[PDB]
Paper text:
The principal constituent of the protein deposits is one of the most abundant proteins in the extracellular matrix (ECM) of the human cornea, transforming growth factor-β–induced protein (TGFBIp). The function of corneal TGFBIp is elusive, but its ability to bind both integrins and ECM molecules indicates a role in cell adhesion. TGFBIp consists of an N-terminal CROPT domain followed by four fasciclin 1 (FAS1) domains (FAS1-1, FAS1-2, FAS1-3, and FAS1-4). The X-ray crystal structure of wildtype TGFBIp reveals an elongated banana-shaped molecule with the five domains arranged like pearls on a curved string.
Lattice corneal dystrophy (LCD) is characterized by the appearance of amyloid plaques. In contrast, the asymmetric unit of the A546T structure contains two molecules, and the unit cell parameters are not related to those of the two other mutants or the unit cell for the wildtype structure. Crystal packing contacts shared by R124H and R555W offer an explanation for their aggregation phenotype, whereas the enhanced susceptibility of A546T toward proteolytic degradation was not immediately explainable from its structure. The low resolution of the data prevents the identification of detailed structural changes induced by the additional methyl and hydroxyl groups of Thr546. Nevertheless, a comparison of FAS1-4 domains from the structures available suggests that the overall location of the α5 helix–containing residues Arg553–Gly560 is altered by the A546T mutation. The significance of this difference is difficult to evaluate as the electron density for the α5 helix is weak compared with other parts of the structure, especially in chain B of the A546T structure. However, an analysis of residue B-factors (i.e., temperature factors) in all available TGFBIp structures suggests that large regions in the FAS1-4 domain, particularly residues 540 to 575, have higher average B-factors than expected in the presence of the A546T mutation. Elevated B-factors in a region of a protein usually correlate with higher mobility or multiple conformations of this region. If the elevated B-factors reflect a higher mobility or conformational heterogeneity of residues 540 to 575 in vivo, this would explain the phenotype and the increased susceptibility to proteolytic degradation. Three cross-links connecting the FAS1-3 and FAS1-4 domains were exclusively identified for A546T. Wildtype and GCD mutants were very resistant to proteolysis by chymotrypsin, whereas chymotrypsin readily degraded P501T, A546D, A546T, and V624M associated with LCD.
Author numbering: 46 to 633
The structure:
Amino acid sequence: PNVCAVQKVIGTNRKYFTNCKQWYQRKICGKSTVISYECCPGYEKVPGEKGCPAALPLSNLYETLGVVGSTTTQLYTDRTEKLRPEMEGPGSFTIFAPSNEAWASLPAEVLDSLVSNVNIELLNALRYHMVGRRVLTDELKHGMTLTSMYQNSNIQIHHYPNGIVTVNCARLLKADHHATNGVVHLIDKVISTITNNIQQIIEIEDTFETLRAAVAASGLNTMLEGNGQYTLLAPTNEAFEKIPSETLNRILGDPEALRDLLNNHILKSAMCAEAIVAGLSVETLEGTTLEVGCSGDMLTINGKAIISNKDILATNGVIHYIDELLIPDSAKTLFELAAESDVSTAIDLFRQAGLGNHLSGSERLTLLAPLNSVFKDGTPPIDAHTRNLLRNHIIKDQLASKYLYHGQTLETLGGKKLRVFVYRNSLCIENSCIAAHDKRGRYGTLFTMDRVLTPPMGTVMDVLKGDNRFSMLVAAIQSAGLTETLNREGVYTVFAPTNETFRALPPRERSRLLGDAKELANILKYHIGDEILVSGGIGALVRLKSLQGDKLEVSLKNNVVSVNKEPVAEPDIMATNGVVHVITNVLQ
């Protein structure tokens, strides 16, 4: 009876006292926990019975400090020889009592100045830790400010979905210990008054001289002086200095990039370091998502141990000092956001082909860069053919792929026009289809694609006549009167059989297809779909109506296209009026 739970990390003395819960973090930062059982606030064990059935009497506020083990706090109250009678006397009070470890965590210079002068500075600090009314934890989760008993100075309270409550970002260790004249709460640090806002702290600290100048240039000083609850991830001078000067000055000389940069360091609520016991997704003011986490007593952002100072308190929120600049994708050039990504092979080939200048400045372009896996068996060599193909992977204007439409045409650097095909579960531009979300830079946008592009060469008949494998097919096309259909404008899907497919027709079938041209016309129209279906547009199963009227069964399995259970030998050969797919048997 009345049995409370303690979740202790292993290695430590870091402990989490709760209102008996069942949701447990298996790991806290990176160290697993064990759970144990003690008696709850206000219950004591009896020997020979299980649980803790006996309640203990209440005592006054001074005496209750010993019960929760805050004995250094108790000793210093008695030292003042003024505050101890009040804690034993009439009234209703709350005290946030620092733990013994907290008092021992004070630097020697701050410990020295209060205990030297007991009446003055020790009494004043202690009053800031108190409130002139009883407050239970039910009124502590609201997040409001409380007025302390030191000069009516505000205390800032924060609450998080995991139940952790903080008092000036100090963790609340032991909650809701009732007293005869109030309640005692044990907290994890010694807290101090909060007199500066975020902007004032920036102007004071010499380590933020570069940051201070950036804030001024954006005109953001109005927001950082005002009321609000924010977290700032504040970059030191050394963080700025780790960035190459040509990159960094480019940002600072661009009003838009500067604003996006700074917004990526600001969060919409105040978040204390003690809040974070697992990976959490947060959204910045710029829009990028960051994964906040921790490894031991080191806070980490996206796996990098770059938080060098936690819990700097302001009147309008919390500041954490950060050792690396968090440059968002929207502040980066096209080269910067892709150089270390999944398309890094392709980026190197643009550089070797002389096209790196297109990616490195401010031109409004869209880059179609295939994935590294396309180039698994080797890179193509840098000829004039490869050079020409690469110019046609750079699209005029900065575009967003979710706003693309079917009848849109995309113009390349040189003079060609590429067609967009939007399907239900994939989006394609000529033969190449988007394989992951866009990365939007400041001036250009990277589309990640699954394949190298193949721009079209002439009509369907231009494709088939240029290859000796379709000599029997071309004569058959001509005999049926279909040649001029496929040399004019259109949106065809041609499953084009080779000579070796014709070489499989039985003798009885081979000469019955030759004579009966009205029958030949009807057979051929069954092989022609009425819209352009590239291989990256099929997904699982699509029916495509033929010109004869009946439907073909098209499917995609293990990256291989099948049509009516016949595999395609060579897909996605582009033509100005359609697409040609090679097949190795004739359909019926």
